[PDB]
Amino acid sequence: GSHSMRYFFTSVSRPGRGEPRFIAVGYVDDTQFVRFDSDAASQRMEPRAPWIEQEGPEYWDGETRKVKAHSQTHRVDLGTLRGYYNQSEAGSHTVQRMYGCDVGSDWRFLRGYHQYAYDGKDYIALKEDLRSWTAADMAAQTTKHKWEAAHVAEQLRAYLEGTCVEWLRRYLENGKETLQRTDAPKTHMTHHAVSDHLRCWALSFYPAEITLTWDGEDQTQDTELVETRPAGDGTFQKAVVVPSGQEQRYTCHVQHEGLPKPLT
């Protein structure tokens, strides 16, 4: 139902501060699922969403071993990556990860994903296909060869389909009550003038994904693109100025998933 998402991993090399810290977070749509931190008081992974607490210790004890495993493969991988570039161990670097699947309205497998990151942006990402990788460095090739040897892509593809997806639908049916809501955003219309010679926003919506089109004219200068923002509860929130007598022909068009009609 145009609703499916991802798992996030973060590992930070500390400024000679011992061992990296590791953050395992998960998500279904814009609704987060699991919370692991290595300097947390709990060496288990915590559920912050209530509808994953319908899962038993069979699911928790079997997912707290795996995240520790991820922390270890991270804590070793950074030692490798910084070990084979040009760094000093007093240095502090960062590694962020990605793997996962999306699904269409028939809840059937939409294409899945899997990407890595060094200090910079893109390091290695699973391409929009099955067996392949996208690398653009030099070390990237040696490690992607290392994944061409281990036959990683297909053994991860067997998880992207049939393990991420049925668990995704399982989550969509065990939290069906909290994902029935396509919360429509409510609008007003305000004005403020400073010189003698406005605002396009949305306030309460469940998927963050909203286009806010601001007559037959295109723009390049006037609007300041702002990022979509969390309202701290599972809702999200999201200007242009013109001569004081000519702010009266334009309208703001909005398309949202919970909006059957684009708004004038």
Binding site: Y59, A69, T80, K146, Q155, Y159, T163, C164
Partner: peptide, 9 residues
């Protein structure tokens, strides 16, 4: 739910 084989770079 989680990916179960130890991936290393």
């Amino acid at each position: 739910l989680l990916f179960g084989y130890p991936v290393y770079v």
